[PDB]
Design a protein around this ligand. Sequence first.
Ligand SMILES: [Zn+2]
Ligand SMILES: [Zn+2]
Lengths: 102, 49, 111, 97, 267, 213, 49, 256
Amino acid sequence: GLVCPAETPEGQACGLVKNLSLLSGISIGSPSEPIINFLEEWGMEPLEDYDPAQHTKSTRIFVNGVWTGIHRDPSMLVSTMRDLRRSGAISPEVSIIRDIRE
Amino acid sequence: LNDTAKRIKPEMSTSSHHTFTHCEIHPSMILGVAASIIPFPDHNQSPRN
Amino acid sequence: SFRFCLECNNMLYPKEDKENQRLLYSCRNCDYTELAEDPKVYRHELITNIGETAGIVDDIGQDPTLPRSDKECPECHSRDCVFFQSQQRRKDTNMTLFYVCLNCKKTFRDE
Amino acid sequence: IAFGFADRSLPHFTKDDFSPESKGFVENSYLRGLTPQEFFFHAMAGREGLIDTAVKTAETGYIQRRLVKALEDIMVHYDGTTRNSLGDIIQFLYGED
Amino acid sequence: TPALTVYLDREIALDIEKAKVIQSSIEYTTLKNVTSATEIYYDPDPTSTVIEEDFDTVEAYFSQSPWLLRLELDRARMLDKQLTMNQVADKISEVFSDDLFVMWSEDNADKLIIRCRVIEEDQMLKRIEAHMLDLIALRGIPGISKVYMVKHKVSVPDESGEYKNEELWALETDGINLAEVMAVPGVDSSRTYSNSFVEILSVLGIEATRSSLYKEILNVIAFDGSYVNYRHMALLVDVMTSRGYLMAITRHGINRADTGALMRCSF
Amino acid sequence: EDNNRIISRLWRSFRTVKEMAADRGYFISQEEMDQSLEEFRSKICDSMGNPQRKLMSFLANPTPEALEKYSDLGTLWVEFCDEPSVGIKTMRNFCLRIQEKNFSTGIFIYQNNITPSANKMIPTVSPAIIETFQESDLVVNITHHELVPKHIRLSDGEKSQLLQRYKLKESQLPRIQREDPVARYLGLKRGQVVKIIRRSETSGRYASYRICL
Amino acid sequence: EITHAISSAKEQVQEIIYKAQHNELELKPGMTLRESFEGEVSRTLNDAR
Amino acid sequence: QERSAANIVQVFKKAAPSPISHVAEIRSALEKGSRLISTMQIKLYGREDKGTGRTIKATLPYVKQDIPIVIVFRALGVVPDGEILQHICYDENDWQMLEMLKPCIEEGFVIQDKEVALDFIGRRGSAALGIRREKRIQYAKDILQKELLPHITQEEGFETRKTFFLGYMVNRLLLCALERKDQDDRDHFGKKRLDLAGPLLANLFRILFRKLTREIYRYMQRCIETDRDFNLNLAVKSTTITSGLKYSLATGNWGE
RNA sequence: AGCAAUAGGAGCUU
Ligand SMILES: [Zn+2]
Ligand SMILES: [Zn+2]
């Protein structure tokens, strides 16, 4: 869905030069401040109040590759974040990625 | 069903109940600009595409 | 599982009370020395199984990508369970599966 | 076809599905037409073939050049022997026949 | 992928139990291969114990350092290599003659155990344990990490002189130790072959090296049904063995000859 | 137990040594050729069963054919030593005994290692020749292997004939190292040429010649 | 006939999968249980085709 | 232009004739500008069954030799080994990982305070020879503050967050080493980024405009000596940005 | 009776 499975040069450039799929799009980037504010509202607790002796079940939250906190219940946070993105409050090109085993 | 001409859409029998979250808008959109000119690209071996 | 110091908060190492022949645990920073319970001092494993059932969470029922099976919960008679194989990824690992009830949340197996 | 996604080949399959369709079995014929999944798997295989053709030819050409340079000076002489440019014998009779 | 092809003696070559006994003789096992988990217990008094399983055993074994090593031996793993407690304890004493004193539980015991005593020593015990687990051999030829029971469809003449197939057990291995396997009784010492022709050169000479080299090249070419005439591969292997040693097809081989400078520079 | 296996391996090595001597041209009595494991154990081992290797040490004389052919073929001494490691001391005794009874060639079969310090005395003991082999290497006779064709050292006149037939110089021949297992087994000295007849799938039979480095 | 043969091979593969999952598959020398499972499935599907 | 993503930890296996077995590599960049700053690996020395010390040693930027991990954890301001382990170990009950963690603790038992460890880092900072302790400390503290995970933060007084990210990286390293988690996929397309006209022109413009500001400095060194008022319209050589952008866009060579 | 070089990039057939 991201790059065409068929269009690639022959020869020594094979597989290194790719071609975008028709519905592909490249993100422009977006400020991370509203994301952090939404996260802070819904219940994320900071790392200055973190103690892995107690927090054995908590789910850790990364933002742009930066670990910024942990949550007691990722389910409602991902649901609300997805609803905010699908309502327009968050930029539509913002990834909201829950990992469940990790 | 039982159409000897139309291609068999895969059985998918292992899973009791599917919980889909998304659908492709159209599967031909995986191709790019140059591959989109090809008529019936699913009837060719990929090197020819 | 090695403990830590009740005063200096470092970790205690083994030692011998040659005048009593009892395994103590010595702090290399402070002078505190407490009595221990277990005379084991070392372990080594080659046939391990840590990571068999550990790959489970409370909300593992919320994963919509896991295949759902019809196995009966021996516990809770549930006719709906998501399932997966051993999450250890070694070459010689088994291929037996694990079964999680979405009703009772007990993990089980087919044996 | 490897599990390029986490525990699956494509995001249209479920986790830990080892069935033939999940791991690259194409049930249709070219006449009947491939499904999108079969099309993508066949594209991966054809791409592997193209990469192999593109990449092994350099090793093969290097090998053949080295063989030619190693054997370039070897000739059958009028006494039947097989000698190099130094006159050293490689075989006392060519092909042993 | 190093590999030997060990042809068996004919009496062994037809029987399967004998072939499996030869397999057991040729395969390499270390204490790692039969060890589950090693412990360390502080046992201040040699004649007594703080443990509750082996107290009866050591009271039946009697009528130095207080540091003890308690390694455990799984049942089926011990079972599969035809190994019992006696040979293992003997082998431990073989290299720890008098700088170590070995106790071993019996084979029928509900727990298969070994106990050792040293004659601050909580780290020399760890070093000794590592050296034992990583260097004690039990049986077989070092360098042979796996052995397979393979079948070869040899064609031999009948008693009427007519060629008839004949179904014999032979051996394939992983790893290479040609000299020691050729000596093992029950092996056809005149037919053992290796797929590493450097080993052949070190063991059998340069003509056998040429034969092995031709066999490998023929295998590589004829794998896919291609047929190259004999004389070309014969020439290639004769150039590679003409000096008495293996001359590689590289700059390190070609440019070490005595030919003119312009040829070597042109390459 | 392990003693029977040790004795059997030693007997196999002794048979290989005798096969070496007979192949090299020396006369060996037909009865000592067919030496069997039990009779060897009778004549060599002890009450405790461990073997005295100082009785195995024999003396071999050249067969008259290998004198008419190899005029430079003298008298052989073969010693199985008892010290696993061998030092300059034992090598000094061996060389003294070899020069003491004008033995042309002395084969010194050892067990474990010959230390480089001791090894340096091997070539400096002219005009006698001292070669050494390890017992583990001699367990299998490699000239009986199917991949090892039969090597036959040429005589001086035949080497000259070979060089003249091909209008050759010595350096233009295929070569064999003096440390080659079959050159070592044959006692090849520098300049001597073996003739190697071998199987040929295109012609049936093919004769090869290699010169010793 | 062709679709019956393909369905039979799919059933055979499903049986191999069941045998591997309930730990009853017979391994081969120098080959892992997972590699044995994969080799048997590949054999089955190549013979199906 | 296709490039691996930034500010993500990836853990790779290594090769047989290599003392290093497992390597966690992260490249760092800032939310403003989206430019690379520094890279910092945490390698696992010790092969399977060989290389008896299975320690983990970091590689800070601007230092020549690789520092052990407990040393930098102490240098960042958490001395007690219990707290170090807790930053590494979220679950005390797990035992195999704790059994694989002892050689690090032993190889870094010498240090017991922040100053000595931070000097130990400083003694390797690749600077000039013979700096005294009080400013070797300042140099090393500057390295630990800036050029160490700038994406986390570059201001002082927030070392705990950097310690937590280090604990996470070490934990992922051990998960990959203890086979409890699979190695990261190099070819996964989700761990890659595409640089379009925006970021490419941003990089080139940053280079050329720093060139221009250096020119402004190299003019204000001389002209101010004359002690005259200047109108700045002879101080900017406008041809620098124009020639640079035109050269790069006309040749394709992206750089000076 | 006289038609520069060096680079980079995109391609052709194996
Ligand atoms: Zn303490
Ligand atoms: Zn239930």
